[PDB]
Amino acid sequence: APPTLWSRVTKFGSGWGFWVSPTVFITTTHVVPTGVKEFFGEPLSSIAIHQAGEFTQFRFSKKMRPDLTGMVLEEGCPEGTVCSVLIKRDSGELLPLAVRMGAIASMRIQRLVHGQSGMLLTGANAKGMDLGTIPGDCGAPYVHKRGNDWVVCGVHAAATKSGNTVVCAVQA
Numbered sequence: 001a002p003p004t005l006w007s008r009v010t011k012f013g014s015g016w017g018f019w020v021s022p023t024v025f026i027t028t029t030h031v032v033p034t035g036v037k038e039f040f041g042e043p044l045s046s047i048a049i050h051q052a053g054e055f056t057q058f059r060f061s062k063k064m065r066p067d068l069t070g071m072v073l074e075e076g077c078p079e080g081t082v083c084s085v086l087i088k089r090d091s092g093e094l095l096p097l098a099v100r101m102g103a104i105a106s107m108r109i110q111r112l113v114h115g116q117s118g119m120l121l122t123g124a125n126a127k128g129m130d131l132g133t134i135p136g137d138c139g140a141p142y143v144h145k146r147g148n149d150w151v152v153c154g155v156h157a158a159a160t161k162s163g164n165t166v167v168c169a170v171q172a
Contacts, residue, residue, distance in 0.1 A: 008141070015138035020073050023062075030157075053114055054155075072151040084099070084142070100121055105117040116154055116170045125164060132163040133163070133166055138156050
């Protein structure tokens with residue numbers, strides 16, 4: 001994946017989020033800080049905030065990342081297609097994990113979670129930090145190409161104990 005795409009992945013709350021455009025930022029609800037009066041130094045009164053299940057979208061009045069073009073945010077990931085989860089680690093690694101996307105699901109982990117499931121294509125068992133997702137990774141974007149353009153369709157929310165199955169929050 002290209003440098004500008006990775007530069008959209010931003011540390012946020014207890015996880016990450018993704019700049020879809022100069023003004024739109026998406027993340028996973030449970031990583032969002034609570035009881036705060038600003039995000040990225042902007043007061044709440046200059047941010048349109050919409051949280052729907054585990055999907056959170058912010059729209060800033062100020063142009064926060066004018067270096068960026070606006071990309072398409074899909075309402076979910078195309079079922080059956082291969083996406084990439086653009087994982088950044090706080091130790092500096094970039095780990096784009098290939099994932100084949102499945103159906104909208106609800107499942108009990110450890111608690112019920114609701115989003116789009118997928119299967120990592122990284123190994124036989126994607127347990128641990130080298131082949132799969134770990135605590136701290138939530139909010140990472142699920143992306144794929146459409147024609148010559150990249151699009152984003154979800155943000156990382158969960159993974160099963162074995163680690164092979166992942167769940168992204170989606171807008172719809």
